[PDB]
């Protein structure tokens, strides 16, 4: 009942009682209670003052502590001597605690440290735990490390239940030790590994874990000493399947090998292949946890200890000498781990091969093909459950290795005329489709163009000969291997020289080959989306855009077709092209629209091309286009008005460039036109127009309130428009428009009150517009939540 | 407890009877549905101590019967009140 009180020692003693007399802190209380700690051995009152001085002592009286450390120390030695002669627990525990505080804050100091250290092997748990935590706090808060390390070594050498306590001591104190004492302790823990007891083994592996986990410097652990620990600790390998010490063994090996690689990378990579061989050998254990631990261990070692230093290693062949030969041994071990003897860990082994592919395929390509052939042979099993894992492995191998080297290793047997029709390597084309990202395009040309032409001709010849079964198979084959082009256009390295060899091919395949067209369009888009990083590449793409653009325009404008993919390709491929040909095509499209001898479908297609060409032109072309499209906003055709409003939205969409300059030059004319054409706007045309209005809100000046208060009812009636897109646009326009009133005045709340009282009459008129205005207030209430002012909200409620 | 202690049939003191009739007058204008056992308690009281009830107590229990009736046991209380010989 009294411990939980705020006035008790739980909270307030730690805060306000440390200020002894108003100033923190004074040890005059401590020095005044000497008459209680002398000649009085009463329990439960010594404990209380000991607890109080333990809590008070932490608030740094450091120069006073340095001065009267002798007084405190002699007081403490008489306290421990009297209490050890008496045999109590609580008073000893907090006098150990205040020893910890005093020695952390600060010849006789070694004596105080020895007195604190000597009570650790005391059989009472409360004395021992407090002594352990105190020594840990003193050392980590060092000239006293040698003494406590020698004490621990002699305590082990003299000695069966205190060994685990002082192994926990060594576990918590190994990083803060000098190198010779670390070597002596390593010898001592190996000497206790000479025994067969399990708990001492687990605690010594935990000590080695805490040593290798902290990543010690050169003064604590050297590379030679780490190598000696690694080679000396190989002697145990408990049996194969113990599962309690094996995980700790693998754990200290990964941490020791990581530290060895961090100290000296060539020596660590030299010692690693034996560790990989032992890991592969212990993958035969029947326990799944050993498999998971080994998988994670070898994966993280390959990710952190091998991959960043692989570029320094360079290319490796079959006749390597240095660490490249070590990498060859690494791969030899993990490839010998692909045999039949596992047959249950093949998912983990395939994960290891996949991460090794991703780490080192590009620099290990000469020697790394035999395992590719072996895993190709593994997929020929009648019932393989790791088909997805094997496919991911081949995908990583294609990504890093490159499909040219893979096809040198495992060639496709679909080269022209086959006697059978049961393709055993038909998964390679989906793998190459899914996982080519960084391979040269010239390989794709010189290997996949004539083969595609011959198989397509063979499919046509078999279709015209009556056989409709094999022809469909060959058509599916060729259509799948034409989908490799988006993969090869991901990050090409020679697209500055190899794109010239595919320009006319892609032109004819997009003109008179419909079955490829979408993919070709996608390929083009995919290329742009990650291929215009350099400048010569973009120059080549523009130089061929001057040829592709009439072809794409004629493809989109033809009567009936994948018009939307062509439209998206045209949009991006016009955003990456030069402005003069944009102006020329804009002139041609304006001539085609203004020509009265064109059909309605052709007119709408050329208006879509005008929509595409609008944001990429200069200010004069955009201005003359706006002058041409301005009478079209009052047209009775809903499609023409919709395309006109989409043009006005697209030219106002650019935040910078000629479009923004055009808007800044023609804002008044745009406002008058949009207010005049408000009376004659069709129902679909509301959906783009609001966005156009949105595109002139977020830079609207302060002298434009009449335009906004004229636009209010249109925005509300579009918040309850038929189309959900128009509703979303009107809601976003309301949010941005309320944001626009957050810039016209100093008081945000008053401005939003004005914005509300501009829309408050909407709760008065016709039933449908009342519902419209309630929906508008519902949307506005969720965005500017507190800024309306709750009482006003209450009135609305 | 009321029903069984009235079934004890002891010589009832009259302050006790005043307390009981004061309790039943306390149950005058309540609209809660009284149980069948409430009417059983009333029946036991008017069976045992009908002679010790004065005329005003008789009529007071009469409008207590009127406002809080029972389709089954109220006529029994009616005939016990109407055939009661006072002291």
């Amino acid at each position: 009942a009294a411990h939980k009180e705020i006035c008790a020692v739980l909270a307030a003693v730690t805060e306000v009682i440390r200020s002894q007399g108003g100033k923190e802190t004074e040890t005059e209380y401590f020095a005044a209670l000497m008459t209680t700690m002398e000649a009085v051995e009463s329990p439960e009152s010594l404990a209380a003052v000991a607890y109080l001085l333990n809590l008070v002592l932490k608030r740094v009286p450091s120069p006073v502590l340095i001065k009267k450390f002798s007084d405190t120390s002699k007081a403490f030695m008489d306290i421990m001597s009297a209490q050890a002669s008496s045999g109590s627990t609580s008073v000893l525990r907090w006098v150990l605690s205040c020893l910890a505080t005093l020695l952390r804050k600060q010849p006789v100091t070694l004596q105080v440290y020895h007195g604190l250290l000597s009570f650790t092997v005391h059989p009472k748990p409360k004395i021992r735990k407090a002594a352990q935590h105190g020594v840990c706090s003193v050392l980590k808060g060092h000239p006293a490390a040698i003494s406590t390390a020698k004490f621990c070594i002699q305590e082990i050498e003299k000695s069966a239940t205190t060994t685990l306590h002082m192994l926990t001591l060594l576990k918590d104190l190994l990083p803060c030790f000098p190198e010779g004492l670390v070597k002596s302790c390593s010898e001592t823990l190996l000497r206790v590994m000479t025994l067969s007891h399990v708990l001492v083994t687990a605690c010594a592996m935990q000590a080695f874990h805490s040593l290798f986990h902290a990543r010690p410097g050169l003064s604590t652990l050297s590379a030679e000493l780490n190598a000696q620990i690694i080679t000396a600790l190989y002697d145990y390998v408990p049996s194969e399947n113990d599962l309690q010490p094996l995980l700790a063994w693998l754990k200290v090996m990964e941490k020791a090998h990581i530290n060895l690689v961090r100290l000296q990378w060539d020596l660590g990579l030299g010692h690693l292949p034996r560790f990989f061989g032992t890991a592969v050998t212990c993958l035969l254990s029947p326990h799944s946890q050993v498999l998971t631990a080994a998988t994670q261990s070898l994966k993280e070692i390959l990710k952190e200890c091998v991959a960043p230093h692989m570029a320094d290693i360079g290319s490796v062949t079959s006749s390597a000498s240095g660490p490249a030969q070590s990498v060859a041994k690494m791969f030899r071990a993990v490839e010998e781990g692909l045999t039949y003897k596992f047959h249950a860990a093949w998912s983990s082994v395939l994960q290891l091969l996949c991460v090794f592919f991703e780490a080192c395929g590009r620099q290990a390509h000469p020697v790394m093909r035999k395992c590719l052939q072996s895993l190709c042979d593994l997929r020929l099993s009648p019932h393989f459950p790791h088909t997805a894992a094997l496919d991911q492995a081949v995908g990583a191998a294609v990504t890093s290795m490159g499909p040219e080297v893979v096809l040198q290793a495992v060639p496709l047997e679909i080269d022209g005329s086959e006697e059978t029709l049961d393709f055993p390597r038909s998964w390679l084309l989906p793998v190459i489709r899914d996982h080519v990202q960084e391979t040269r395009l010239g390989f794709f040309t010189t290997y996949f163009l004539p083969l595609a032409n011959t198989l397509k001709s063979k499919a046509m010849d078999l279709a015209q000969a009556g056989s409709t079964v094999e022809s469909k198979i060959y058509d599916t084959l060729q259509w799948q291997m034409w989908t490799l082009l988006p993969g090869f256009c991901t990050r090409p390295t020679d697209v500055a020289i190899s794109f010239k060899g595919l320009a006319r091919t892609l032109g004819m395949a997009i003109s008179e080959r419909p079955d490829l067209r979408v993919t070709v369009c996608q390929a083009l888009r995919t290329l742009i989306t990650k291929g215009c990083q350099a400048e010569a590449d973009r120059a080549e793409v523009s130089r061929f855009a001057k040829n592709f653009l009439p072809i794409l325009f004629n493809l989109y404008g033809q009567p009936v077709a994948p018009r939307r993919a062509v439209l998206e390709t045209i949009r991006t491929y016009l955003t990456i092209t030069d402005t003069q040909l944009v102006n020329s095509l804009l002139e041609k499209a304006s001539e085609k629209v203004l020509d009265p001898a064109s059909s309605d479908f052709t007119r709408l297609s050329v208006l879509d091309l005008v929509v595409a060409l609008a944001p990429c032109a200069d200010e004069a072309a955009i201005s003359k286009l706006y002058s041409t499209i301005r009478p079209y906003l009052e047209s009775k055709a809903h499609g023409v008005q919709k395309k006109a409003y989409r043009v006005l939205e697209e030219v106002c969409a650019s935040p910078q460039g000629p479009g923004a300059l055009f808007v800044q030059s023609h804002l008044e004319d745009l406002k008058k036109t949009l207010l005049d054409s408000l009376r004659s706007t069709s129902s679909p045309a509301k959906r783009p127009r609001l966005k156009c209005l949105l595109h002139i809100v977020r830079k609207l000046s302060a002298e434009h309130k009449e335009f906004i208060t004229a636009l209010i009812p249109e925005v509300i009636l579009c918040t309850k428009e038929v189309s959900v897109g128009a509703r979303k646009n009107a809601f976003a326009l309301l949010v941005e428009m309320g944001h626009a009133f957050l810039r016209f005045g100093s008081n945000q709340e008053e401005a939003l009150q004005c914005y509300l009282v501009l829309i408050y009459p909407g709760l008065v008129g016709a039933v449908t517009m009342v519902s419209c205005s309630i929906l508008a207030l519902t949307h506005l209430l969720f965005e500017f939540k507190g800024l309306m002012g709750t009482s006003t909200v209450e009135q609305l409620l | 407890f009321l029903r069984l202690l009235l079934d004890k049939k002891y010589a009832l003191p009259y302050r006790v009877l005043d307390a009981l009739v004061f309790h039943f007058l306390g149950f005058r204008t309540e609209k809660r549905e009284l149980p069948v056992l409430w009417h059983q308690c009333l029946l036991t009281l008017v069976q045992r101590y009908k002679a010790d009830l004065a005329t005003d107590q008789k009529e007071a229990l009469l409008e207590l019967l009127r406002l809080q009736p029972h389709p089954q046991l109220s006529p029994e209380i009616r005939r016990e009140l109407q055939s009661a010989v006072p002291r």
Binding site: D422, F423, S426, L429, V469, K472, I473, T476, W479, Q480 | -
Partner: protein
């Protein structure tokens, strides 16, 4: 929109019996949906067409060996009758 059971099981069986006559785009899927199955509900026919378009854009990216043996099995079943 979430998916049901009947549309997709009907799509699965209609592929398992007539995978040869399907196409790649939505309109050909619609056309084979009228000309193969009666499908009195127009909503169900539209959903079947959408899911079979999803199936044709999904399975055509896979291995060709399974497609080839499935065409052999379908041609054998057609020739047997």
């Amino acid at each position: 929109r979430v998916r049901t059971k009947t549309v997709k099981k009907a799509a699965r069986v209609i592929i398992e019996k007539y995978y040869t006559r399907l196409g790649n785009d939505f309109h050909t899927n619609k056309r084979v949906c009228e000309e193969i199955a009666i499908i009195p509900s127009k909503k169900l026919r539209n959903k079947i067409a959408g899911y079979v378009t999803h199936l044709m854009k999904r399975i055509q990216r896979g291995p060709v060996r399974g497609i080839s043996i499935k065409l052999q099995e379908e041609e054998r079943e057609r020739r047997d009758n």
